[PDB]
Design an enzyme around this catalytic site. Structure first.
Site, short mmCIF file in Angstrom:
data_model
loop_
_atom_site.label_atom_id
_atom_site.label_comp_id
_atom_site.label_asym_id
_atom_site.label_seq_id
_atom_site.Cartn_x
_atom_site.Cartn_y
_atom_site.Cartn_z
N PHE A 209 10.88 1.42 -18.43
CA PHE A 209 11.40 2.58 -19.16
C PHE A 209 11.13 3.80 -18.31
O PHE A 209 10.03 3.99 -17.80
CB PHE A 209 10.75 2.71 -20.55
CG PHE A 209 11.47 3.67 -21.47
CD1 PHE A 209 12.66 3.29 -22.09
CD2 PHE A 209 10.97 4.93 -21.73
CE1 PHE A 209 13.32 4.15 -22.95
CE2 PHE A 209 11.63 5.79 -22.59
CZ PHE A 209 12.80 5.40 -23.20
N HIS A 212 10.13 10.36 -19.24
CA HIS A 212 10.56 11.07 -20.42
C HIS A 212 9.39 11.87 -20.96
O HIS A 212 8.24 11.66 -20.59
CB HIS A 212 11.05 10.11 -21.52
CG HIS A 212 9.97 9.20 -22.01
ND1 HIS A 212 9.45 8.18 -21.25
CD2 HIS A 212 9.28 9.20 -23.18
CE1 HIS A 212 8.49 7.58 -21.93
NE2 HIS A 212 8.37 8.18 -23.10
N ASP A 214 7.93 12.65 -24.92
CA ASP A 214 8.05 12.06 -26.25
C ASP A 214 8.74 12.99 -27.25
O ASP A 214 8.57 14.22 -27.21
CB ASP A 214 6.69 11.69 -26.83
CG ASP A 214 6.13 10.44 -26.24
OD1 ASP A 214 6.80 9.84 -25.36
OD2 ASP A 214 5.01 10.02 -26.63
N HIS A 268 5.93 10.85 -18.69
CA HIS A 268 5.36 9.54 -18.42
C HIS A 268 6.46 8.49 -18.38
O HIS A 268 7.60 8.74 -18.79
CB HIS A 268 4.28 9.20 -19.45
CG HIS A 268 4.76 9.25 -20.87
ND1 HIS A 268 4.98 10.43 -21.54
CD2 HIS A 268 5.06 8.26 -21.74
CE1 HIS A 268 5.39 10.16 -22.77
NE2 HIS A 268 5.46 8.85 -22.92
C1 LIG Z 1 5.33 4.83 -26.88
C2 LIG Z 1 5.50 3.59 -25.96
C3 LIG Z 1 6.95 2.95 -25.92
N1 LIG Z 1 8.03 3.95 -25.81
C4 LIG Z 1 8.88 4.30 -26.80
O1 LIG Z 1 8.65 3.82 -27.90
C5 LIG Z 1 10.04 5.25 -26.42
C6 LIG Z 1 9.59 6.40 -25.46
S1 LIG Z 1 8.16 7.18 -26.27
N2 LIG Z 1 10.51 5.91 -27.64
C7 LIG Z 1 11.64 5.73 -28.30
O2 LIG Z 1 12.52 4.94 -27.87
C8 LIG Z 1 11.84 6.47 -29.57
C9 LIG Z 1 11.90 5.45 -30.75
C10 LIG Z 1 12.02 6.30 -32.06
C11 LIG Z 1 12.16 5.38 -33.28
N3 LIG Z 1 13.36 4.44 -33.17
C12 LIG Z 1 12.35 6.22 -34.54
O3 LIG Z 1 13.45 6.12 -35.18
O4 LIG Z 1 11.41 6.98 -34.83
C13 LIG Z 1 7.05 1.93 -24.77
O5 LIG Z 1 6.00 1.23 -24.65
O6 LIG Z 1 8.04 1.75 -24.04
FE LIG Z 2 6.68 7.87 -24.48
#
Ligand SMILES: C=C[C@@H](NC(=O)[C@H](CS)NC(=O)CCC[C@H](N)C(=O)O)C(=O)O
Ligand SMILES: [Fe+2]
EC number: 1.21.3.1
Length: 329
Positions: A209, A212, A214, A268
């Site tokens: 990933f 980005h 958060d 990150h």
């Molecule tokens: C935080 C760690 C995790 N990353 C993530 O979850 C990534 C970047 S923070 N975040 C997202 O895609 C947002 C999901 C929001 C969720 N569907 C909602 O409706 O609230 C990873 O491990 O890839």
């Molecule tokens: Fe994140």
């Protein structure tokens, strides 16, 4: 080699109590971490993370392809037009390794006023069949409240750290209306691992990933003991060590907005690792109409040149933008 990021372990237990002096000393540690790499581990947090990990594993490893379609968000199943956020996010063998299940506030019931109004970002959670996943829904709903409680305590720490009264954020973080979410992410071991599911950074690092910030006020994250996260600093990207006994905490871009960038949302990314592991974030989101007036703790009068932004606006648009930037998860 890549250098290790400074990620202090902060005993947050005073934030549950009534020792104001002890809470200020925790707030100072949060201030220091937030001004440095932007990450810390909350320890002595009171949550049974081993049990979280076990119940999550039981779910991830027993859910079937049939159940995944039946729970799928709109991006994977056009029949489920109401499921923008909550539901199952499918893998695509040969192309996309990650899969996950997202759920929202259990109080978003059919009778909730925001559900009745069909307000964006509010949805009624979908759950697998109880007989196929005994105890899972009840465990997951209780986990929401356990991590909500930790997050409320952390928000008291952030408020104190910024020179505010301890309820400055927490007064907008309420069981009846929080837009906070849990995501139960499975990153699988795969042999062979699809190269199409691996991205490459400008510096050659293989990623799952991309970089980005958060979309959150703060993010409260459990992960397995498999090192994967990196944070960008002035000295370059640095590895965040794993700690599967703690919660990794960082600010999101709403906090950066509110503080006029005094507490930045750290940039990150997630390294590619061929390992079966869990990433279980709780995104601390406020209510849809919550507006915190921006300020600046580095300026004598605290005044900001930013405009107030309602949380619902911020969230709906932030989640779409993150999908556009880094792909549908
Ligand atoms: C935080 C760690 C995790 N990353 C993530 O979850 C990534 C970047 S923070 N975040 C997202 O895609 C947002 C999901 C929001 C969720 N569907 C909602 O409706 O609230 C990873 O491990 O890839
Ligand atoms: Fe994140």
């Amino acid at each position: 080699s890549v250098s290790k990021a400074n990620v202090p372990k902060i005993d947050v237990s005073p934030l549950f109590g009534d020792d104001q002096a002890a809470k200020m000393r925790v707030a100072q540690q949060i201030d220091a971490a937030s001004r440095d790499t932007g990450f810390f581990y909350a320890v002595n947090h009171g949550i049974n993370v081993q049990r979280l990990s076990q119940k999550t594993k039981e779910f991830h490893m027993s859910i079937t392809p049939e159940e995944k379609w039946d729970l799928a968000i709109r991006a994977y199943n056009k029949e489920h037009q109401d499921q923008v956020r909550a539901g199952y996010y499918l893998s695509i063998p040969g192309k996309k390794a990650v899969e996950s299940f997202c759920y929202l506030n259990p109080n978003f019931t059919p009778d909730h006023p925001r559900i009745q109004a069909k307000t964006p970002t509010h949805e009624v959670n979908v759950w697998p069949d109880e007989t196929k996943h005994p105890g899972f829904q009840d465990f997951a709903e209780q986990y929401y409240w356990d991590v909500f409680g930790l997050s409320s305590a952390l928000l008291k720490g952030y408020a104190l750290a910024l020179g505010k009264e301890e309820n400055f954020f927490a007064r907008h973080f309420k069981p009846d209306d929080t837009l906070a979410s849990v995501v139960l992410i499975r990153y699988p071991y795969l042999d062979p691992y699809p190269e199409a599911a691996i991205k490459t950074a400008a510096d050659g690092t293989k990623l799952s990933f991309e970089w980005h910030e958060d979309v959150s006020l703060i993010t409260v994250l459990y992960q397995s003991n498999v090192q994967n996260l990196q944070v960008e600093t002035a000295a370059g990207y640095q590895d965040i060590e794993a700690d599967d006994t703690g919660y990794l905490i960082n600010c999101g871009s709403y906090m950066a907005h509110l503080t006029n960038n005094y507490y930045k949302a750290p940039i990150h990314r997630v390294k590619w690792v061929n390992a079966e592991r869990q990433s279980l974030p709780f995104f601390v989101n406020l209510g849809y109409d919550s507006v915190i007036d921006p300020f600046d703790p580095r300026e004598p009068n605290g005044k900001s040149d930013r405009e107030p932004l309602s949380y619902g606006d911020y969230l709906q648009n932030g989640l779409v933008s993150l999908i556009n930037k880094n792909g549908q998860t």
